[PDB]
Amino acid sequence: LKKFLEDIEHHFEPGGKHEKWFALYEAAATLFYTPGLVTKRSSHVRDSVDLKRIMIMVWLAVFPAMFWGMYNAGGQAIAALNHLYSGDQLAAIVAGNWHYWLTEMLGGTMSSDAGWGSKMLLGATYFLPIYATVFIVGGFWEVLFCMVRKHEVNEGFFVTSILFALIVPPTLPLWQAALGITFGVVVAKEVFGGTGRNFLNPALAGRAFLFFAYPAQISGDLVWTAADGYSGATALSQWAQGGAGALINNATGQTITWMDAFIGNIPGSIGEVSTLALMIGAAFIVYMGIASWRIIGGVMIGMILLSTLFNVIGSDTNAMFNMPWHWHLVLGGFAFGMFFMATDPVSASFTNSGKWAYGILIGVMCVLIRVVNPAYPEGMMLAILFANLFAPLFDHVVVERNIKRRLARYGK
Amino acid sequence: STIIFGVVMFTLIILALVLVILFAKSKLVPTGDITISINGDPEKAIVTQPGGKLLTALAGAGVFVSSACGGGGSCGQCRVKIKSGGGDILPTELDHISKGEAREGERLACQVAVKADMDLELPEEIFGVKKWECTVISNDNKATFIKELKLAIPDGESVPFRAGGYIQIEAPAHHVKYADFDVPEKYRGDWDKFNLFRYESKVDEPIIRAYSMANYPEEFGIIMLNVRIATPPPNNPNVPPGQMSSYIWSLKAGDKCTISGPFGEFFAKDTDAEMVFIGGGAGMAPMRSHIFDQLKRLKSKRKMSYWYGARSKREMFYVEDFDGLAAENDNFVWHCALSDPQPEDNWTGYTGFIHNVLYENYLKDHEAPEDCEYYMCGPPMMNAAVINMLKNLGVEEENILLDDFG
Amino acid sequence: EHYISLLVKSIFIENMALSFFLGMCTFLAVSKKVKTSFGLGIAVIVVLTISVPVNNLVYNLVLKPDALVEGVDLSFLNFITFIGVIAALVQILEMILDRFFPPLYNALGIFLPLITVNCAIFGGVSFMVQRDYSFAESVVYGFGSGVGWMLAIVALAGIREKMKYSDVPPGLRGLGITFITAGLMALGFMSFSGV
Amino acid sequence: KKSVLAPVLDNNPIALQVLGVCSALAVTTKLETAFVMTLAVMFVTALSNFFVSLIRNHIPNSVRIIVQMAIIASLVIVVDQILKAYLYDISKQLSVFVGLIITNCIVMGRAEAFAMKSEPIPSFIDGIGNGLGYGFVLMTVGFFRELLGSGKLFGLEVLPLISNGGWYQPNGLMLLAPSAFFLIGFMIWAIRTFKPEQVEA
Amino acid sequence: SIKKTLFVVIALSLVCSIIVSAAAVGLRDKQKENAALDKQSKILQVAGIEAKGSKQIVELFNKSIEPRLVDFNTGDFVEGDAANYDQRKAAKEASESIKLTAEQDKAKIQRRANVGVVYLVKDGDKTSKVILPVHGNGLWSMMYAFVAVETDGNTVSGLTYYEQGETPGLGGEVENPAWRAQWVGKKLFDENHKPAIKIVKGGAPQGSEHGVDGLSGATLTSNGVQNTFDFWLGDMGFGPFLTKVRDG
Amino acid sequence: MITIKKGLDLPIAGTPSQVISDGKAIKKVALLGEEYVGMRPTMHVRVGDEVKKAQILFEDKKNPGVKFTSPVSGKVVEINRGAKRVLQSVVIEVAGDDQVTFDKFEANQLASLNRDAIKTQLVESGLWTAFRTRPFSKVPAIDSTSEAIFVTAMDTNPLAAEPTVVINEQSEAFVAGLDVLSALTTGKVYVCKKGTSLPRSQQPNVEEHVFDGPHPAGLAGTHMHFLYPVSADHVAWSINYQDVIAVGQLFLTGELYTQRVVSLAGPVVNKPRLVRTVMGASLEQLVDSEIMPGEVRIISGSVLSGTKATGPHAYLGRYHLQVSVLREGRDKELFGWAMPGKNKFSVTRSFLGHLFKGQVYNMTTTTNGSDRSMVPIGNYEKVMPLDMEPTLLLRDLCAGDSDSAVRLGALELDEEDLALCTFVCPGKYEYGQLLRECLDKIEKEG
């Protein structure tokens, strides 16, 4: 590969043809092989870390959540299908859905005796097409801007593509996934100059676009389980209706315990369900210093304080008032947003003091939307997007206090 | 019925609103006269009513401030030192004034609106402006598009100015046809190639421009000057012809024009560093004064060089004078290269543009090109190109002074 | 009580800038610098907190139907009355600041000419007539709308200042990117829409 | 002719200038309201410019703004009555933005920039031209927002909807605030790539 | 010159006001008719009377519709200017309205007018149908509807939502003709003379007496519709009036 | 006294032995023009000219009166010039022992000397160039004065020599130099050192301050920020301990003292140690027969801040007290960015190397990645102990917002103060150059 990559560089050079594809060919060469660049001036030595390794660490950090998500997505769907149909009726349903008979063809079974392999396989049939569509469509916009503007491709899109695919319902139509990533990549990032030069979270901007443009496909009772003809409310929606007592899984008929939500054995977005899986990945990137623990700490502080305040105030009518902090933690997309989306460094505050305020605002807003906004059962995406708008302001307040300390010579 | 009530109610509301505004203005907006001190002299202090720009009040008094763009804040030649008052510096002013200058208090009088008492410290040069109407003596054409103008002082003595200065010329509306101009036969033949006499200029309103001096200080009685005719671009015929330059060319012996005192900021440095001159077109006026000033007025022994850009032997002028100065004093040497010698010129010397000729002849082998004072005046193409070569030689901007005439 | 919801409604739930699109010309213009943007927001609040309650009394005492006389309703004299009154108060406030509060004139009076006949003030007063608000509600609403307007402009100024590091394509640089930026801001402010 | 079309693509009040943005983002959800709004702004802008020019020499600078606003406000009040009496349905849709025409920066900008220092006849044409360019952006945004958000143009079903036994699913974001912001920005981008002179340094 | 300024402002104010005053006062009659026909177009549509054009709407509304005022506390007809009655304005004033308790306010409406207008459809000298305006808070905005109740006082003939602000596709489907058409033939009350109309999440059983399919993916808006009928058909709404209708 | 916790000590292999030995004989010396910030030279010598030890070679046009004098006596063999005729170096071939002498004083008189007298001797001898001003890291103007002169008697640069070992051999000169600085300063002299003991001045003006912590704890910029914060109106002077010994020698013997002790160290240096050399010594001759085979990079100064010693720049810098030699890191590795970094050092904990604590790394000149836009993961805050918001400041430098950078503390910074920020940047920005671009803009516009 090394010899082939080096030799073909002549063609992609300005003298040779296909120069318009240099930004993509050089990306492949640099992607496979680290460049042989040496420092040109001081510092003559550099840290081993680079943008490529940072993104891959985040990309790997969500793998455990992604793998469980596929397993959970298949499990929820298979359970619902058997709870709704049986016998030849199930066979017709399986025959009328390419997700179902493709799983049968590859060795899985849609029967209730299905093991983890068939459930994970079935969940893959939903996740992979979404991820492939998001990667290809979003990657096309990335290369187009780089090619036209003569920029080198940036590796930040790897995190955006995977995260966006893991925050959508399993049943999301592909054509809507293409539009969602297109809005997030283009409107939120590229027109600002690409990775590191924007202010809004790209993946959440794409989800918000679908959230407000096609609400029927990303809300309600028909999108969070991939069993055709099945209707089931998620835990957050159920709590808003009848409190903790309403937390029931109709497909399986079993009550939803805190442990169930914690492990991720609940309907929802593929990737968000398992708080345990997200914590495992979040621990690594936080330990590695890639994700800010001040933002994560701030989010927890804001969530616990406001939720406890709602607990004390009480409400005989709004059941969301009595949801405790530890239930807020394991429900919806709070865990996913706090660890892998609130920590987006570009859209977060650039000062350590601001990061605390930035995270606290995120945590406060999520509970607020969850509790006192009837329309939306969850508000993590909206909370983060709202917090992005004010992150530069927290930095400005902190920096202006720094400037006042300096004009006083730090009291020296 | 309702129509009547609305009509009266409408008027009451409007009258009540304006009466409050009009009443408030009288009791909140002072109408006292504004007093501005010029250079701290009580006699020069000017009392002016509120309103208007600073450039207007000063002009009425005995101090005249140079201005090219006028009330647009574009040229920046009207910079004044405002010790106090006038508020903060406007963002447009910063475009032509550096931050350090703003700390000193430099401001544009035209861009500054007079609304409160202000203190000004205008220098002697701006303070000492005298308006005179000299008499035109000769208007012969020096070259194809260059005319030498001689002005006779009307009040006697001579105009006090420094080498490389200029005088602002103001003229009223007047219609002049290029056919009215008188040109020698030598240059007439070249003019006959395109028949530029067809052009006709009609200056609708009075105009003000600047013109550099071409007489060294010791010269008394005649104020030599060089004028370049303004014509529409060869590639853009749909442009009005010259308005101020054309009017000057229409004048002959016995004509009168105003000089409105001297001005300028183009001068040499009182040091022993070698001087280098790059003249072009109308630039031969200020350059000539420097050579004359440094030969008899000061009798300077410093090295002096001149590099004039010309297109043909006909364009060359003052050659006989230059030869005498070089021959009489060896400290000064002049050179010129022809960008396109005529077939009959039979030039056997430097050929091309001074952009590369000067480098390939003098600056290439110069041991300390940076340790030299550079003065330039000529077409923008020659000026812009030359500085790039000078920049490539490590010549600092502070060592080069530009006086481009356009 | 009732006032806090009204104050909360006029800041977050109802956003005069990002939802009703009022004052966009000035909002999308002076947004470059946070310090200047903060000054305009303060100036807008002063005009709004004074304009709305003053117009509320005028509307309820003169323009309100069947108020001056029985059977006559001078509703059509609504736009002229409000715009004229708003112009007077803004103009009157500026002059007194330059005569008694020099420091406030530069901080607040400098922006007042822009706030004269501004869509932000007129729209807020118009909504105060489209509804039935008491004088106390008029003041709480007027103060709330201005502060919420200040929140959006001050937020947009932080983003624009942060965008000094951005690389916007030519054609979008300046106004074009700012409109996109404002659109993104409106996206995040729709979290309170259902509230 | 040149002056009439100058404020369309060369000196657009909303693309190059930032005047009239408030109405652009509010009424462009439908072409009927958008189209009617252009007529109201054109009618007021042209008349206000015409009248202010007639009394320009006699207008006192002390209360000039009041005089200009009274003329503008009076016309808008008249326009409000016409809309209420005729096109009542459209009047209800426009909500309070008919009155906001008075504060529309285009109306006041031309009343001072041009009408106060211009002959009344060309002043009227300037008002018509500015209203035209204002409507060019208003109608362009209205076209996409109605077509993509409802599948309808002027209330006529262009794209059959799934809810009505069709194939097209309308985009809900085209009805909300952000869409107008994004469409205008991309419209400015398109305009400035074909007229690079308007690019900001 | 203060005299010059006063002359221009006074003269300009007088002429401009005259045009404004004349325009508003003169066109007021036309404006009143235009506003009215919008409500008449809806009432005719729910009534099943096909009309087209302002002239036809006005002519047919007067011929077939007889607006009347009703007192909720008694459910008995009262005398007043029904044709020019604004129930919304009345509901905002304590003189002609009341404040509901939290328990009573099933429809979540803050206030309810003491007297509300109703519309009777008459083929001839006989009332073939009664139209009852009912409103209740939705997810996003107050929703106003017209309900055409047959002479029986139980069966519903037509429904239409003429003012709503729910999300199109999810909650704005109350305007969908297919969903509205499902109400025809349903019964507002059960045998025990109690509200029985129920919005069934997931779709009502076919042939249901009181089963209307809820709006798919729009439980919150569908909940509002249920709350509207649970209140307006109850004691504090049109319940007592419908009891009188059942017996004449 | 002042303890630093935010910073980074780079564990590069080849630390010096901290024993002073005699280096290879040097027959070539040069002064480097680009090293002096904002210096436009006025040449006073030509190739083939004979010069004395302390004879003037060139003058500064924008700093009149400052004389850059030769370190050695000999012949001028070349005057290297670069793009735009930028003076790179003036190489002098060592020959003879002629020198320019000056006045000499007893150690007990130095503290009492007149300030103008001290300035004249320092300027004429060329030793005035040892001082650098903060802000702008320029040679102080002849007529200027400073209320705070900072003496850097410590070195936390990687592979740096220990000042205590050098200062101990020249205790009297160092104390004599401090006495001269006591009279030169209008205010006080800050002797910034480590906890170890050093010779002390008996003048009340000379105050000893201890700084503990990693790099940047031994940087003059760090010391100024904690003891005498600088601005446009509060200018401090910086001088290193070896120049202080030179100042003391000049006023004790009346001769320019040009001997220096520099650490020759690095992964490819066979015997890393301290060597005695001369100012501007040819590094090609200094490192001869002391480096491992291969393509190496010789650096005047530290690997964090320093000049590539190649061609006309292959001479010891005026302010550099060490020579670091590294391998050129041109190797391309398959998925090198994706490997567990047992042998990779990082500020982050994303490599295995940080687990093997106490390990040393054979760092090369590899950039360890391509150039990318800043993605701040908090690396800058981890190595920046000053009271600043580095990410915001670095963004200002990237955008060229000179005025904003001034508000955020750019005027307090020299290039070396941002070396760690450059080192840890995932986007591979080089903030030292950006800071200089901002500082130059402020000087010119101001």
Ligand SMILES: CCCCCCCCCCCCCCCCCC(=O)OC[C@H](COP(=O)(O)OCCN)OC(=O)CCCCCCCCCCCCCCCCC
């Ligand atoms: C990181 C890259 C992106 C993410 C990629 C994620 C890919 C997910 C693929 C899931 C595949 C799971 C296969 C697990 C095999 C072990 C099976 C096991 O332990 O569970 C048993 C369970 C139930 O058993 P049953 O199906 O009933 O068969 C036995 C009948 N007596 O199940 C079974 O017995 C297994 C029945 C299914 C066998 C399928 C084999 C071929 C298809 C799977 C591989 C391709 C997946 C798609 C492409 C991915 C490419 C990245």
Ligand SMILES: Cc1cc2nc3c(=O)[nH]c(=O)nc-3n(C[C@H](O)[C@H](O)[C@H](O)CO)c2cc1C
């Ligand atoms: C810790 C971390 C978190 C990230 N989170 C997100 C994210 O939530 N959404 C996204 O689109 N990109 C994310 N990225 C990728 C990238 O930084 C982001 O798109 C920036 O906004 C691009 O400038 C993340 C990167 C890192 C290192």
Ligand SMILES: COC1=C(OC)C(=O)C(CC=C(C)C)=C(C)C1=O
């Ligand atoms: C980092 O490396 C990257 C590539 O490497 C080959 C890509 O092709 C592309 C482009 C992808 C597609 C599907 C066109 C992107 C976006 C990218 O980031």
Ligand code: FES
């Ligand atoms: S006259 Fe040109 S700047 Fe004032």
Ligand code: FES
């Ligand atoms: S249109 Fe200009 S502020 Fe509203």
Ligand code: NA
């Ligand atoms: Na969970």
Ligand code: NA
């Ligand atoms: Na909620």
